[PDB]
Structures are given as structure tokens and as C-alpha cells.
Amino acid sequence: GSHSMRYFYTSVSRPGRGEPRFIAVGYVDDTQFVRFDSDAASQRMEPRAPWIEQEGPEYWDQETRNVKAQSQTDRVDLGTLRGYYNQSEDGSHTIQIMYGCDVGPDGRFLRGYRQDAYDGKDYIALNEDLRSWTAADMAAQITKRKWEAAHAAEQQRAYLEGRCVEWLRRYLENGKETLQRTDPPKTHMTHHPISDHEATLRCWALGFYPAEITLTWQRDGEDQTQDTELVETRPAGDGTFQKWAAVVVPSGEEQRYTCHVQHEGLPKPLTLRWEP
């Protein structure tokens, strides 16, 4: 399959409570492999997956230096953006950054991304061509002009097409025993009467990786949305995911309903029907 590497940075100002809280996490697909937390005792980039632990001391030294430098840029940027939006020195604000690259099954570059937020809203984004920016507002237009003048796109493009894909390929090789797994969902259905005339059918998917999955209820082969509940896909905390979909049905009509399960790890999609 295709693979992705993504980094997620959060910087939160806490005026009068010291420098901003900076948290960085790194993912390959849905697997976290590193973290940095400005508040933690180590002051180091730290491993969060077994297959990254084999990286030598030079890896940890350089990752720590680079992520600390980015936490300092974000600290300065919180001050600049507070200025741009004419905000009080007293309020807490948040910068978020997501960047990364996708590779195909051949390990070759497909796409790169870099997107920044302020207070939970789009601020500035690197365009698909990795040569130009989209600003969300007039403050971000100021950033866009500074970034055009500094040729910031060129540095992002060189990383995203170079070190990003090169190191993603290396991680996919070092972690191949775990990162190339497709754990199919283990499924079951439950039945609970709600009244003398209605029952809940709940279709379960457990123990699957990656997270992407579709659960659909049909009645007589037609997609149902009314009287359904679909929960958000959730982590089990063991490297797998869980999801369920429920439908409320008339009592004695359970057999008209089918739950369809689609996942990368299934040779063919599964269909479950309430089996008395």
C-alpha cells in the first residue's frame, strides 16, 4: 500500500506561567513513533515505537536540536500573531502545525503537505505544487509575503521530496514486522430489545489496523441512515482500532438488516445478519 509520515506540533501560550507548552508527535500511517514535550524532564525527542529505538545517538541528538529550534520559532510566532490580531498579553493562544509526505507502494513521493493554524482555524497552507501558499486572512497575508520573500516554499519542497520520503522508506523497512500489517476487523453483532416493538442491532469491528474502516447498515440491500448510530473510530490502546454501528429496528424484522464491513485487511467485504 501507500504510506504517510506526519508531524503534529501544538504550541500553547500561558502568559505569566513561563514559555509556551510545545508538544510534537510523529506518525507513520496510524502509528506514533516519536514525541517531544517542552514540560517533560528529558528535554529530548523520545521513542514511542519499538522500531525507532535502534536509531543511534546522532539521530536523537539531531531530532532533539531541530524540534527544540521549532518550539522557539513557535514561541516567537505566538507573539507576532498576537500583534497581528491586536490581542491582549493576558490570553492563551494556540499555533498548530501539520506536515508530512505520502509515498506509493514503490516508496516514491506522491504528495507533501504543510498546514498551520491559529486558535483552531486555518492560518496558512503550502499548496499542492509545494511552490506557493494560501493565506486564510489578512494577518496570514503578512506571513505569506514574508515567506515568499524568504523562499520558504523551496526549503519545505526540498524536505518533503528529500529527507521526508527517504526517512519514511527507512522507517517502513526498520518497522516492517509491524508497519506493513493489515489486521482485519474481528466482527460480531449484538441484539438488545428497547421495547416490546423495537430492538437495537449493534455491529462491532474490533482489533483492526489501519484505522480506516466503513460500517454500513442496509435494510433489504438499501443503505440506512435514519435510526442509526455510528461512533467515531477509537484506539484500543494496543495498536488497533474499534468501531460500531447500531440500528433500531421493528421487532421481528431483524433479518431484513445487514451490516457491511469494508477494510484494507479483508480479502472481500464482510456482511453480518442477526443470527437467532
Binding site: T10, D37, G120, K121, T190, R202, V231, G237
Partner: protein
Amino acid sequence: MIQRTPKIQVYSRHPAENGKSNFLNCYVSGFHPSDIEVDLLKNGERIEKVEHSDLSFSKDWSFYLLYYTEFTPTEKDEYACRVNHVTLSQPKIVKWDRDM
């Protein structure tokens, strides 16, 4: 500025069997800003030593965290997740239902 209220799911890592060791999870997602208080409750009392995942966020910039503890479910013990967040007027409690 925008804020977003936390979504909460409370569930076990494996299907619950009375007397068998398991993990109790409270998955808190869709919230902004990042500052949040999450307690796991056993019979209305705060469980100590609860751990959580590293802060990350979704496509819409909203945050998510997994809070978890090792536990042994029994027939009579009730578990819940209790969340405080700047967006809530009072603590939000979700009780653990074994089939949710």
C-alpha cells in the same frame, strides 16, 4: 475565537469478562483548546495512576487524547469517565456500558 466541546467514549480494550484483567479507556476527541481534565471513576471515586497518550489533533485541528488504566471488571463495580473543559458548564460524565 472558536472552541469545541469534547466528545467522550468509555470502553474496555478487550470484551469485558468479570474477574479477567483488562484496560478501561476514556477517548476524548473533537475538543479545542487543548487544556482538559479527565478522571476515570470507580463507584464515583477517582482512580489514581491513570495514564494518557501524547496530545495530537485531527483534520479540523480539534484535539484527541486516550486516558487508560489496567482494571479487573466485576458484576457490581460501575466505571465512568468525567471530563472538565473550558467549553462545559459542568463536568461531563459518561458511564461505561460493556456493549458500547
